[PDB]
Design a protein around this ligand. Structure first.
Ligand SMILES: O=C(NO)c1ccc(-c2nc3ccccc3c3ccccc23)cc1
Lengths: 115, 111
């Protein structure tokens, strides 16, 4: 079982269902089950990195790929007026699952501060 | 050009936390948490929606630099990283920037 046994690892291996938007060899984008905006999805690496704080230097291009895929998916979903991308780290950051994930939120005005 | 270009060119003051050959990290002038800094590329990418495939490594570098600076600033209970795009995202400056906020409980939703 590669991809870990967090719920996101199970999603990567298709053991638990999800609403997939995009998939490649490095990542998976799927809709969030508790959406906080009209569109709210997640981009995750297939490689299990538990949190951004423990990312390796050579995870740079993979983390960049999360953002590129996020922005492509936002465009393909028609988020023409923009969006917010969020990574949560740890307890103060509100991280809910210990597998790195980029939130992408749009279809409404996002406010400041970002929580 | 933007105010962030001015900051990169060292034409206006900013409290710089880290610099390398391709990015700059500095405290946000209107902080929304006890720690609130930005990591920006020196290359002028106006918004993440127009970033190119070849920019992947650079964008990843912003996040690795952000996470290293966060550790160095003592953000051991965690933090939140944010990129805003366009009007709905609340993007305030048309130069790509990664926010890093911590030192307090961040809430949900994230705006
Ligand atoms: O307890 C939690 N936070 O404190 C929590 C953490 C993960 C999921 C969760 N997220 C998802 C996001 C996108 C797609 C599917 C799911 C999903 C599917 C089945 C069971 C749980 C989840 C739900 C709740």
């Amino acid at each position: 079982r590669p991809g870990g046994d967090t719920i996101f690892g199970k999603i990567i291996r298709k053991e638990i269902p999800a609403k997939i938007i995009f998939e490649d060899d490095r990542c998976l984008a799927f809709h969030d089950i508790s959406p906080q905006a009209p569109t709210h999805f997640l981009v995750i690496p297939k490689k299990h990195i538990s949190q951004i704080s423990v990312a390796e230097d050579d995870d740079e291009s993979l983390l960049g790929h999360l953002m590129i895929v996020g922005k492509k998916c936002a465009a393909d979903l028609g988020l023409n007026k923009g969006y917010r991308m969020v990574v949560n780290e740890g307890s103060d950051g509100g991280q809910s699952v210990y597998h790195v994930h980029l939130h992408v939120l749009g279809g409404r005005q996002m406010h400041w501060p970002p929580g």
